[PDB]
Design an enzyme around this catalytic site. Structure first.
Site, mmCIF file in Angstrom:
data_model
loop_
_atom_site.group_PDB
_atom_site.id
_atom_site.type_symbol
_atom_site.label_atom_id
_atom_site.label_comp_id
_atom_site.label_asym_id
_atom_site.label_seq_id
_atom_site.Cartn_x
_atom_site.Cartn_y
_atom_site.Cartn_z
ATOM 1 N NE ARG A 1 26.733 43.411 35.487
ATOM 2 C CZ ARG A 1 27.592 44.824 35.350
ATOM 3 N NH1 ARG A 1 27.463 44.474 33.870
ATOM 4 N NH2 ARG A 1 27.356 45.777 35.874
ATOM 5 C CG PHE B 1 31.209 41.383 27.142
ATOM 6 C CD1 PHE B 1 32.511 41.158 27.833
ATOM 7 C CD2 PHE B 1 30.969 42.426 25.917
ATOM 8 C CE1 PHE B 1 33.201 41.444 26.776
ATOM 9 C CE2 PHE B 1 31.263 42.890 25.867
ATOM 10 C CZ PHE B 1 33.231 42.408 26.339
ATOM 11 C CG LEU C 1 33.953 47.487 26.198
ATOM 12 C CD1 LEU C 1 33.443 46.373 26.779
ATOM 13 C CD2 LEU C 1 34.388 47.889 27.865
ATOM 14 C CG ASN D 1 39.562 41.423 31.197
ATOM 15 O OD1 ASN D 1 39.462 42.721 31.699
ATOM 16 N ND2 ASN D 1 39.024 40.902 29.706
ATOM 17 C CG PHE E 1 26.284 47.282 28.549
ATOM 18 C CD1 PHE E 1 27.582 47.611 26.675
ATOM 19 C CD2 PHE E 1 26.591 47.016 29.664
ATOM 20 C CE1 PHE E 1 29.171 47.497 27.453
ATOM 21 C CE2 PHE E 1 28.560 47.121 29.914
ATOM 22 C CZ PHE E 1 29.096 47.240 28.787
ATOM 23 C CG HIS F 1 36.853 43.032 27.808
ATOM 24 N ND1 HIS F 1 36.224 42.380 28.589
ATOM 25 C CD2 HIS F 1 36.324 45.017 27.752
ATOM 26 C CE1 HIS F 1 36.308 43.532 29.917
ATOM 27 N NE2 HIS F 1 35.753 43.702 29.272
ATOM 28 C CD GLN G 1 30.680 39.365 32.098
ATOM 29 O OE1 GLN G 1 30.051 40.591 31.894
ATOM 30 N NE2 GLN G 1 31.346 38.478 33.486
#
EC number: 5.2.1.8
Length: 164
Positions: free
Chosen positions: A54, A112, A121, A101, A59, A125, A62
């Site tokens: 991903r 990521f 985030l 997660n 951004f 995370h 991942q």
């Protein structure tokens, strides 16, 4: 004292380059040790040969699902998912390395690499490392992502391990 680990990235099987990471074992030892051990493969399983499934430009990239290759798998070195160690470190900008997660206290092996500041985030995370060398390689990987995260070329960890 903080360990350094490397990824050798390939794109449709062709070498792209090396990304290295400082792991903040002084801060988040259990989380750093998980990622370090998965990167050496010393438990018999880990990141070598897995893909970045991903990638969303601007951004994050991942990866770490070495089990199911699509975001539904992966496992820690601890025999079960493990707790969020602390949220001392924040998502400050590009290069931050953080745990993916499925909600509180569900860390496995997926992680990521941020390509921007992602403060929304913080507290969700666990940040545990940062790119040390090769951010340009992460930037090259990023271009093979898309808006919904699907990659247009297969991005793989062709080799990985511990440096120094």
């Amino acid at each position: 004292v903080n360990p350094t680990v490397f990824f050798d990235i390939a794109v449709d099987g062709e070498p792209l380059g090396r990304v290295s990471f400082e792991l903040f074992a002084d801060k988040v030892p259990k989380t750093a040790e998980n990622f370090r051990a998965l990167s050496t493969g010393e438990k018999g399983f880990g990141y070598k040969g897995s893909c970045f499934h991903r990638i969303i430009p601007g951004f994050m990239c991942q990866g770490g699902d070495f089990t199911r290759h699509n975001g539904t798998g992966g496992k820690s070195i601890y025999g079960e998912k493990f707790e969020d160690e602390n949220f001392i470190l924040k998502h400050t900008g590009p290069g931050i390395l953080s745990m993916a997660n499925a909600g509180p206290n569900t860390n496995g092996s997926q992680f990521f690499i941020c390509t921007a500041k992602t403060e929304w985030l913080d507290g969700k995370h666990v940040v545990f490392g940062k790119v040390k060398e090769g951010m340009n390689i992460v930037e090259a990987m990023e271009r093979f992502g898309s808006r919904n995260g699907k990659t247009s070329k297969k991005i793989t960890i062709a080799d990985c391990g511990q440096l120094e």
